[PDB]
PDB file of C-alpha atoms in Angstrom:
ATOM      1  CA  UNK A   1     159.356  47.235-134.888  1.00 26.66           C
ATOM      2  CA  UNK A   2     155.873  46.859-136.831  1.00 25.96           C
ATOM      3  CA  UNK A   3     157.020  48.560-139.443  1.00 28.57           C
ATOM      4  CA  UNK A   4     159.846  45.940-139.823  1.00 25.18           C
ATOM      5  CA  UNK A   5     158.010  42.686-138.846  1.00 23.70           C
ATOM      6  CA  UNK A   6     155.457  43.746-141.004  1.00 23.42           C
ATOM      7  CA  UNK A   7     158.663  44.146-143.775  1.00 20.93           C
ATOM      8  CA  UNK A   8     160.595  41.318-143.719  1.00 20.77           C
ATOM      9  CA  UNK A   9     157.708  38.486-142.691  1.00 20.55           C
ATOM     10  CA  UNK A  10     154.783  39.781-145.255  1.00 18.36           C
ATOM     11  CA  UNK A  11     153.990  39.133-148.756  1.00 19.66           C
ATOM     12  CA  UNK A  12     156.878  39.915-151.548  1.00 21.11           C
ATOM     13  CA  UNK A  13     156.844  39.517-155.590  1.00 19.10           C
ATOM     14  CA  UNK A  14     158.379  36.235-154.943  1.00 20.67           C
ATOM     15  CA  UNK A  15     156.440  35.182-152.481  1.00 22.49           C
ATOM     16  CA  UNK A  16     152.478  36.665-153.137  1.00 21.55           C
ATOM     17  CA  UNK A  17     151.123  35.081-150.324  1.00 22.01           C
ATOM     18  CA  UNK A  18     154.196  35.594-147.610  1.00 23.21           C
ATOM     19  CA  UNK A  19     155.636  32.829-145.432  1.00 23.19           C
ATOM     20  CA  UNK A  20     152.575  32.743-143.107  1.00 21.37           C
ATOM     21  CA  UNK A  21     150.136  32.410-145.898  1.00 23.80           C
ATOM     22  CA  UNK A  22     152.591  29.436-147.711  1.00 22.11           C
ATOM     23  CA  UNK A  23     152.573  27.547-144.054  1.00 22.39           C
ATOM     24  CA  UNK A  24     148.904  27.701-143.305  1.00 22.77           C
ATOM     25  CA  UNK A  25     147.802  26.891-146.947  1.00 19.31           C
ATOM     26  CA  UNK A  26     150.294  23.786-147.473  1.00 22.40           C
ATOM     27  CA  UNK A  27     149.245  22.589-143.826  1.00 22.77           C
ATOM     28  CA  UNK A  28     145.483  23.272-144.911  1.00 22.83           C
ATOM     29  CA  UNK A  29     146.105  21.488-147.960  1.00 19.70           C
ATOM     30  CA  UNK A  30     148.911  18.514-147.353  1.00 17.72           C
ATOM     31  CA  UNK A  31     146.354  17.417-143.813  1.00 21.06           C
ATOM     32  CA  UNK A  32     143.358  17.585-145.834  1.00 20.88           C
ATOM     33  CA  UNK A  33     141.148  14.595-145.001  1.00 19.14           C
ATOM     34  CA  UNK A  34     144.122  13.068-143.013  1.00 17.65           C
ATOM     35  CA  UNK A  35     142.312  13.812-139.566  1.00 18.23           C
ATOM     36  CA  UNK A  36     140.361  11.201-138.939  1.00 20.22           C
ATOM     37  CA  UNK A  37     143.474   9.013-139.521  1.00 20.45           C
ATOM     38  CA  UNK A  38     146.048  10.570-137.972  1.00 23.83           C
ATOM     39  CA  UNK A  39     143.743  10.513-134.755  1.00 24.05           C
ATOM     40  CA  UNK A  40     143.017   6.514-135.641  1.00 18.86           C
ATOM     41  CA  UNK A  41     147.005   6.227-135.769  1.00 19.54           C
ATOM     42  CA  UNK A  42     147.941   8.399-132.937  1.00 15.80           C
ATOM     43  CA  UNK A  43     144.949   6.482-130.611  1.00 13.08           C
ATOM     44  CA  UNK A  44     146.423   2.735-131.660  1.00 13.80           C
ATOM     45  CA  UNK A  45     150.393   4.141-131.469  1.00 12.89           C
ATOM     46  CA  UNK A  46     149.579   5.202-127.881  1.00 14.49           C
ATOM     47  CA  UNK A  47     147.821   2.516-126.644  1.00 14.97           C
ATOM     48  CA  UNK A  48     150.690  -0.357-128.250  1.00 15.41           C
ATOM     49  CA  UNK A  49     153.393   2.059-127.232  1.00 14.72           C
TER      50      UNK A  49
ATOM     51  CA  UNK B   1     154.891  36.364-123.315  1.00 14.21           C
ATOM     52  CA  UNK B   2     154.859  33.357-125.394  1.00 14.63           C
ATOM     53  CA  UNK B   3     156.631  35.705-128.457  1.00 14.38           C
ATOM     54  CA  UNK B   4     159.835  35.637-126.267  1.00 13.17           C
ATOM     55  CA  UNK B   5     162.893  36.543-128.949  1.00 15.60           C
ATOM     56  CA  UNK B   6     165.111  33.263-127.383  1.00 18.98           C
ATOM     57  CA  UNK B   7     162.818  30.795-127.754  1.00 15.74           C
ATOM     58  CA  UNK B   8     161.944  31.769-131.426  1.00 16.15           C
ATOM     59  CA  UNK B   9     165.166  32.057-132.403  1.00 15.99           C
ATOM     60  CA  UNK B  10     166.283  28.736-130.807  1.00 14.41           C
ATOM     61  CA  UNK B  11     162.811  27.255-132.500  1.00 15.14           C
ATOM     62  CA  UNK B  12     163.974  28.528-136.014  1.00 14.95           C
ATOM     63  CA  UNK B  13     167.180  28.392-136.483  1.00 14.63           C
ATOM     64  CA  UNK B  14     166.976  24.375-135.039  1.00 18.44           C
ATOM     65  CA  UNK B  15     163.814  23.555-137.524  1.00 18.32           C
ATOM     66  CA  UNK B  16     165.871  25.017-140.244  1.00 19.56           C
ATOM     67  CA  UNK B  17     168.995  22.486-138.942  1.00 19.76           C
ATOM     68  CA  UNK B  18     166.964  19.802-138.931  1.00 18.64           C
ATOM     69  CA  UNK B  19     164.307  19.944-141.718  1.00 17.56           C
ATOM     70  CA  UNK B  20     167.108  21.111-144.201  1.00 16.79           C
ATOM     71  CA  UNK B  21     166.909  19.115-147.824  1.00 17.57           C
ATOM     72  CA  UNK B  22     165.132  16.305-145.894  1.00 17.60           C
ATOM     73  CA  UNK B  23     162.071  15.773-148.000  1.00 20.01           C
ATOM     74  CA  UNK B  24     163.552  13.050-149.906  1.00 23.30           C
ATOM     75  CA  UNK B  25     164.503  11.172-146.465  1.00 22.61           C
ATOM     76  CA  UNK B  26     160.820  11.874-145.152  1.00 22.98           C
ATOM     77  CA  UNK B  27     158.970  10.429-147.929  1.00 26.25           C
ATOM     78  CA  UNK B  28     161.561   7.155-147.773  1.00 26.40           C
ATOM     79  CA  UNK B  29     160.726   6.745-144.773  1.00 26.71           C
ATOM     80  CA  UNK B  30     156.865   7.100-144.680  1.00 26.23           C
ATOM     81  CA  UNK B  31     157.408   5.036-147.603  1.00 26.49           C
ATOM     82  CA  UNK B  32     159.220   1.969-146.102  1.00 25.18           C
ATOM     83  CA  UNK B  33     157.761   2.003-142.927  1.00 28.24           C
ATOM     84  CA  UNK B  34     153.876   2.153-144.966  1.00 29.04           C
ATOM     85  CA  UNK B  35     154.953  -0.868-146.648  1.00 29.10           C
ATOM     86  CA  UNK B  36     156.067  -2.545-143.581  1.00 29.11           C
ATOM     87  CA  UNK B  37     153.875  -2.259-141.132  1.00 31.99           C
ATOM     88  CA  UNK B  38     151.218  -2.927-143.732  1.00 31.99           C
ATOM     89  CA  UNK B  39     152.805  -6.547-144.197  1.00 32.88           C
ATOM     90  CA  UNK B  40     153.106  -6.795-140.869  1.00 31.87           C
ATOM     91  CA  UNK B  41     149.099  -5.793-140.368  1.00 31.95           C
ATOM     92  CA  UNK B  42     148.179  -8.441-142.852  1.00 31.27           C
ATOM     93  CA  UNK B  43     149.196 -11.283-140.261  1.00 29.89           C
ATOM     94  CA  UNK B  44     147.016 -10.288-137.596  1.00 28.56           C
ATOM     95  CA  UNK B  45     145.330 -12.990-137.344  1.00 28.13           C
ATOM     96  CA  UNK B  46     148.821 -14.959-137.358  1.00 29.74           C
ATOM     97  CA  UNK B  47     150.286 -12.892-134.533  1.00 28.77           C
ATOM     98  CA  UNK B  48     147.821 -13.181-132.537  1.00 31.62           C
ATOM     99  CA  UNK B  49     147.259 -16.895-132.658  1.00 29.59           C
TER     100      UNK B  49
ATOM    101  CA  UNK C   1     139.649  48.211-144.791  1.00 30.93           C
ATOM    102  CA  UNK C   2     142.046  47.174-142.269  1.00 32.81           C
ATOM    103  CA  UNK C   3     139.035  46.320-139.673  1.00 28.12           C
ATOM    104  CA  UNK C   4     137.315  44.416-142.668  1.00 28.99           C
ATOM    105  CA  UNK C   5     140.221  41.959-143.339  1.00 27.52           C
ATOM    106  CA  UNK C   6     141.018  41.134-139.645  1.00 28.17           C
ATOM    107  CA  UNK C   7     137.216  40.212-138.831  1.00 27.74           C
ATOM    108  CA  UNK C   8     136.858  37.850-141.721  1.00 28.61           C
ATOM    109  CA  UNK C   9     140.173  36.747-140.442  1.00 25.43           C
ATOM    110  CA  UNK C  10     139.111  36.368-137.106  1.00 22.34           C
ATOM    111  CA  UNK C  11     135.305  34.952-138.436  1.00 21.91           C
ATOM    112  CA  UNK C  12     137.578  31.568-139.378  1.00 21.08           C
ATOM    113  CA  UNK C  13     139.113  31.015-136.133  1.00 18.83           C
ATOM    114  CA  UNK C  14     136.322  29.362-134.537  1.00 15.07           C
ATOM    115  CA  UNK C  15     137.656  29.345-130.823  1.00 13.43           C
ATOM    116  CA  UNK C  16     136.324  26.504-129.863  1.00 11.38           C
ATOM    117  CA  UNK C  17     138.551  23.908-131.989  1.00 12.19           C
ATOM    118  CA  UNK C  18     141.247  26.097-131.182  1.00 11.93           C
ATOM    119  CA  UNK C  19     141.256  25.746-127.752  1.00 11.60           C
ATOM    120  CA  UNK C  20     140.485  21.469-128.033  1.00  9.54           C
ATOM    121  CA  UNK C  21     143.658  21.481-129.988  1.00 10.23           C
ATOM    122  CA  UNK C  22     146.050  23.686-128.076  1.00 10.28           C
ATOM    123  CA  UNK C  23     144.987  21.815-124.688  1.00 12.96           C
ATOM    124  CA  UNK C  24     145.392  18.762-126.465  1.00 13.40           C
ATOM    125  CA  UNK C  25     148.502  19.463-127.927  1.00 13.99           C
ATOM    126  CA  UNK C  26     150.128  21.310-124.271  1.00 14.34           C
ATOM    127  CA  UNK C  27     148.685  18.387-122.562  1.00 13.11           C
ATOM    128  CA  UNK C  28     150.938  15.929-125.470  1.00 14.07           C
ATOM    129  CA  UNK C  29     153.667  17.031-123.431  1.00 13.17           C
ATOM    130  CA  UNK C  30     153.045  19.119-120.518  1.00 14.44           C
ATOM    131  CA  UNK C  31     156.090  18.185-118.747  1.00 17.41           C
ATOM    132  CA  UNK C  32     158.716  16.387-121.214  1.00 13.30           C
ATOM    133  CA  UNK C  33     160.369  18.227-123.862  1.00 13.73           C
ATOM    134  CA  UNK C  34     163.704  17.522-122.333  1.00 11.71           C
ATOM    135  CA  UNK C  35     162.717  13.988-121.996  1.00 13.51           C
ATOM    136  CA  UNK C  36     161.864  13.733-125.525  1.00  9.05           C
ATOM    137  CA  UNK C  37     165.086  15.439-126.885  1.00  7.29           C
ATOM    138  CA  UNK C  38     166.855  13.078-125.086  1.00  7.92           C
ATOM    139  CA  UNK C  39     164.814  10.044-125.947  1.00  5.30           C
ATOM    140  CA  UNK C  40     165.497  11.078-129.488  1.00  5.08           C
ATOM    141  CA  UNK C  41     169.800  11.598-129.210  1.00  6.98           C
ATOM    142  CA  UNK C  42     169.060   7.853-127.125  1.00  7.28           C
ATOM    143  CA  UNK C  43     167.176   6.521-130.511  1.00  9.61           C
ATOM    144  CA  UNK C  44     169.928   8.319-132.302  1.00  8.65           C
ATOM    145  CA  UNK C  45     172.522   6.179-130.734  1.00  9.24           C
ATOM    146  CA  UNK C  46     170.555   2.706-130.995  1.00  7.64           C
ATOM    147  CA  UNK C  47     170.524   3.394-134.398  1.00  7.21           C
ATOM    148  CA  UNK C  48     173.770   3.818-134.674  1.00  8.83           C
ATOM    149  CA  UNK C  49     174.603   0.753-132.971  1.00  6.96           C
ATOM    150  CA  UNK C  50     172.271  -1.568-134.928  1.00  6.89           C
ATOM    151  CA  UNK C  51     172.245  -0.502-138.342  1.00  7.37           C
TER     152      UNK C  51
ATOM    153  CA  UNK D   1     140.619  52.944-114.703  1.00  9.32           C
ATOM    154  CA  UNK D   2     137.829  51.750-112.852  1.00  9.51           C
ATOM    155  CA  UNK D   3     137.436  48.963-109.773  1.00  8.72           C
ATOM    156  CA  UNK D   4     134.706  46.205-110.663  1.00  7.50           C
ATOM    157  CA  UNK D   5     133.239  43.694-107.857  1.00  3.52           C
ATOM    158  CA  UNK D   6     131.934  40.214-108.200  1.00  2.00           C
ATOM    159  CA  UNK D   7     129.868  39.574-104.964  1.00  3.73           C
ATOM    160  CA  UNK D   8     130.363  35.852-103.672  1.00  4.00           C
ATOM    161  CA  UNK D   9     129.564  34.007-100.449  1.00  3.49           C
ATOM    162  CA  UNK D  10     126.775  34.137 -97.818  1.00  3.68           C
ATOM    163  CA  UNK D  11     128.172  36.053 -95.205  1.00  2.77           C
ATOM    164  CA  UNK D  12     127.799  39.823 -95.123  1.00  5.75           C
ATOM    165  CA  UNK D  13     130.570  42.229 -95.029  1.00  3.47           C
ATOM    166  CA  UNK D  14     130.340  44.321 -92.336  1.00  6.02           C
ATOM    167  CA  UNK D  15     131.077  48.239 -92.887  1.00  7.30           C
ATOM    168  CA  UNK D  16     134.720  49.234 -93.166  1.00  6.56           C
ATOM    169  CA  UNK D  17     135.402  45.898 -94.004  1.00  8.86           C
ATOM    170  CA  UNK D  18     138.740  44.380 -95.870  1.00 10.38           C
ATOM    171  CA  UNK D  19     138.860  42.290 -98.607  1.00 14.04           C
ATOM    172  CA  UNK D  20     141.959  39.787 -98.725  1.00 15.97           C
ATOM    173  CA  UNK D  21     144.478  40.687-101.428  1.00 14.99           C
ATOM    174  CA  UNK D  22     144.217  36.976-102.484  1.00 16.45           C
ATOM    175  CA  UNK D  23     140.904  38.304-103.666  1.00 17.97           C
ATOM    176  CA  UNK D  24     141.718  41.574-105.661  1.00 14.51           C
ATOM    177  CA  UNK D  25     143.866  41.415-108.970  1.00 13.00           C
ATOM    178  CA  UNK D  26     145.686  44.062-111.171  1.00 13.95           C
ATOM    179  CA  UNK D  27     144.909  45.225-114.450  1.00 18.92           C
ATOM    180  CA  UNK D  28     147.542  44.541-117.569  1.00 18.43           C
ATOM    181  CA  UNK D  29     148.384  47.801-118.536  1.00 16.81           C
ATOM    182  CA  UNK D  30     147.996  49.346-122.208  1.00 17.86           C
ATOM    183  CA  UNK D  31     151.759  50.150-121.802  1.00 18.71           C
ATOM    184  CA  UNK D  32     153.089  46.630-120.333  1.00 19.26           C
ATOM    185  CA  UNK D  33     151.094  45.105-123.512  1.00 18.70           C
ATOM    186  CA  UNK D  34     153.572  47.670-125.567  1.00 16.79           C
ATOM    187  CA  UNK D  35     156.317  47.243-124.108  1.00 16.17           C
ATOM    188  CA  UNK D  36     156.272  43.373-123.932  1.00 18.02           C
ATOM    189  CA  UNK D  37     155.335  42.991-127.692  1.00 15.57           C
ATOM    190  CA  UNK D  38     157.897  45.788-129.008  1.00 13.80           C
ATOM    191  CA  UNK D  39     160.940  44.109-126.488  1.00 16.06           C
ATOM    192  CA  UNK D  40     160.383  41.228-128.085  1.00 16.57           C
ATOM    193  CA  UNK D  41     160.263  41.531-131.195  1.00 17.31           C
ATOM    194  CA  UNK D  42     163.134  43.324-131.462  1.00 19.54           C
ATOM    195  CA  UNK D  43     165.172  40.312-130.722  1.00 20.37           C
ATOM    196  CA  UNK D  44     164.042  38.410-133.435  1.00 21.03           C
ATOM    197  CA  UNK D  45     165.977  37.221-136.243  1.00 19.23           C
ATOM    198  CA  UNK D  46     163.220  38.011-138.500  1.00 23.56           C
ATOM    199  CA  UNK D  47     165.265  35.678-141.814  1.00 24.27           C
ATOM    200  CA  UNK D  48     165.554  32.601-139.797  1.00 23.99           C
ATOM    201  CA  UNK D  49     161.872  33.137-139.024  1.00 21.86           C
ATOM    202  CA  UNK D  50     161.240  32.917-142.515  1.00 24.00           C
ATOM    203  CA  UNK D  51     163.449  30.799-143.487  1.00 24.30           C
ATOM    204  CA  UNK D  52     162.233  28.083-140.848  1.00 21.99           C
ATOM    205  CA  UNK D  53     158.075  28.930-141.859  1.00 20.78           C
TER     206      UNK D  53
ATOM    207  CA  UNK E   1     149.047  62.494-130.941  1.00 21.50           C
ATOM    208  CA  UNK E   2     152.520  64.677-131.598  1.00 19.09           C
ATOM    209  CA  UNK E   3     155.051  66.747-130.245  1.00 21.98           C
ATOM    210  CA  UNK E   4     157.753  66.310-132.457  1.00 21.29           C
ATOM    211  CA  UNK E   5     161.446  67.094-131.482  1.00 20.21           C
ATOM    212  CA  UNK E   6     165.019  66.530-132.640  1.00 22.97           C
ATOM    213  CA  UNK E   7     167.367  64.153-130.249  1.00 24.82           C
ATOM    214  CA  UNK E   8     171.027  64.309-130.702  1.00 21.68           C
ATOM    215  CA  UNK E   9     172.176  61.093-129.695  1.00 20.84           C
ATOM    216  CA  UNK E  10     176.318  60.209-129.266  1.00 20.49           C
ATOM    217  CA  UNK E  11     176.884  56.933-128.332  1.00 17.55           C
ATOM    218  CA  UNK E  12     180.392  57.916-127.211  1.00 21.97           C
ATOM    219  CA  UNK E  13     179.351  60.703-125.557  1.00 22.39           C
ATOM    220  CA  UNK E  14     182.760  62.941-125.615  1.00 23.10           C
ATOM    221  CA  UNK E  15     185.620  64.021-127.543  1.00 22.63           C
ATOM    222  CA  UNK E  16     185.862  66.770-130.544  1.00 25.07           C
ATOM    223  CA  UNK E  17     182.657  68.958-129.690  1.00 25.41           C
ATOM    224  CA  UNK E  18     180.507  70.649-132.683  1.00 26.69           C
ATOM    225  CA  UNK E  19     181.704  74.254-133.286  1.00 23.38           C
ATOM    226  CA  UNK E  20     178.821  77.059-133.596  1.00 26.29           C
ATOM    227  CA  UNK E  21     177.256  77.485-137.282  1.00 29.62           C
ATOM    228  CA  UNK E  22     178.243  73.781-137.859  1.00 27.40           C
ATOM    229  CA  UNK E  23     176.079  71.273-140.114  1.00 30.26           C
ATOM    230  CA  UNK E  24     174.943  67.354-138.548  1.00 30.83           C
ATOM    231  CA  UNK E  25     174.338  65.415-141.744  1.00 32.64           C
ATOM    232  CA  UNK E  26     174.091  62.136-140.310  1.00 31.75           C
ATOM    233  CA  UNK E  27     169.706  61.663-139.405  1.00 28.38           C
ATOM    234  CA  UNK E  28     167.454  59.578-139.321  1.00 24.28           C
ATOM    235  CA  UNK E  29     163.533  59.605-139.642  1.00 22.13           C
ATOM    236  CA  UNK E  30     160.911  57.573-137.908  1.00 22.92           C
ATOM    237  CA  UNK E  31     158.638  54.718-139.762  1.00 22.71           C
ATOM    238  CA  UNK E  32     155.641  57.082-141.188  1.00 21.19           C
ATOM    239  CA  UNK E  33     151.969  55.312-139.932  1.00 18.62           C
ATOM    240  CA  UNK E  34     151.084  55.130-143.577  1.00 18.10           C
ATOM    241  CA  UNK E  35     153.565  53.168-144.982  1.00 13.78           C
ATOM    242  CA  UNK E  36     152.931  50.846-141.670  1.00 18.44           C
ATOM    243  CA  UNK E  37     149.340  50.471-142.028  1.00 17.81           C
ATOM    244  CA  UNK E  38     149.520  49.623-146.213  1.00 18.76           C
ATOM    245  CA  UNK E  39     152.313  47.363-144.945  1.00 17.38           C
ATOM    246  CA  UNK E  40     149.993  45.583-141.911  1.00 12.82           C
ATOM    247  CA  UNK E  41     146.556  45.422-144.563  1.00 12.72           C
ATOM    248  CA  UNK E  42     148.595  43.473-147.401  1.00 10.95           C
ATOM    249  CA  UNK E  43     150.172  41.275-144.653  1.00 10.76           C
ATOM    250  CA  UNK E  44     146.493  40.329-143.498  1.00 10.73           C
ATOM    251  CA  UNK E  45     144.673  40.491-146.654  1.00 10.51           C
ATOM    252  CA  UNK E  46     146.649  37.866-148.433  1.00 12.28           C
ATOM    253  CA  UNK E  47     146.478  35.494-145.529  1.00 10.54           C
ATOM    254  CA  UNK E  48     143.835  32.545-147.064  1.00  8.70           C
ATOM    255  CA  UNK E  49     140.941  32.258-144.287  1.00  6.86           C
ATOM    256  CA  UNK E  50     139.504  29.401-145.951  1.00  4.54           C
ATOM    257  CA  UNK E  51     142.356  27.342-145.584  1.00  4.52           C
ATOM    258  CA  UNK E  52     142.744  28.579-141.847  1.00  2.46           C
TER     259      UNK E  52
END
């Protein structure tokens, strides 16, 4: 079972940096310096709401 | 005990039903809504007189 | 090698804004998932009916 | 394996005295932690995993 | 640590029966450690820690 998970969800020559290291780097880089306003946003949606 | 093989699966395969191709809907939407509640936000001052 | 690579993995966790995010994000909804499924097939069908 | 004690409270406890089972917990074993992780993820569908990340 | 063995596994369990002097060519072999280790420090490695 490591063997396999280790297989089929690292990196491959289509994919260098494997799905784990595609998700954390475009959710590093598409919510980068969107904190402070998605907390200002969430804050005023839940107090209207 | 969180890595239960149900739950995953259930996770995944309903992400993939839902978030399939939609990128083009997504950005519609933030767009439209953006511009709308930002016309909305410029009568503050109206709506709350 | 393999030791190397998971502490300068681990060095970036920082478990302190881990933890304020998780609780934050269990205590989002604690108790309704179902509610919120359901809230969204409701939304689904007011949708429907306005549009 | 090896038993570790936290002394709490005021009171002294006598000799052969019995600590309440609310107060004593079990280890995790070595081979639950194996077992859980290996069970699991052998039910994975491993491409929709991918697919959905 | 070790011990290896052989298992002959039948997931039926009965019918013809192997004759003496007689060959098994269907086998299989267990995941070697190195293959799962190489496997386990590319996996990690390319992970980017500045973005996490």
């Amino acid at each position: 079972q490591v063997t396999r998970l280790l297989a089929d969800l690292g990196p491959t020559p289509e994919q260098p940096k494997g799905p784990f290291g595609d998700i954390i780097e475009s959710f590093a880089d598409g919510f980068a310096g969107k904190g402070e306003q998605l907390n200002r946003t969430l804050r005023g949606l839940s107090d209207a709401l | 005990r969180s890595l239960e093989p149900e739950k995953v699966n259930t996770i995944a395969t309903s992400l993939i039903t839902i978030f399939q191709g939609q990128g083009g809907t997504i950005n519609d939407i933030l767009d439209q809504t953006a511009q709308l509640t930002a016309s909305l936000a410029d009568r503050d001052q109206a709506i709350g007189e | 090698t393999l030791f190397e690579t998971i502490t300068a993995i681990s060095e970036q966790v920082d478990p302190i804004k881990l933890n304020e995010t998780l609780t934050a994000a269990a205590q989002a909804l604690d108790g309704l998932g179902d509610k919120f499924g359901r809230s969204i097939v409701d939304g689904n069908a007011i949708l429907a009916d306005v549009n | 394996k090896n038993i570790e004690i936290e002394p709490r409270g005021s009171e002294t406890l006598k000799p052969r005295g019995v600590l309440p089972v609310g107060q004593t917990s079990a280890p995790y074993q070595i081979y639950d932690a194996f077992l859980d992780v290996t069970r699991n993820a052998a039910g994975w569908d491993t491409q929709a995993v991918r697919q959905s990340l | 640590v070790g011990e290896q063995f052989i298992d002959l596994t039948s997931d039926s369990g009965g019918g013809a029966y192997f004759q003496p002097g007689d060959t098994i060519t269907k086998a299989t072999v267990p995941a070697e450690v190195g293959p799962a280790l190489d496997a386990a420090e590319k996996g990690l490695a390319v992970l980017p820690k500045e973005k996490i």
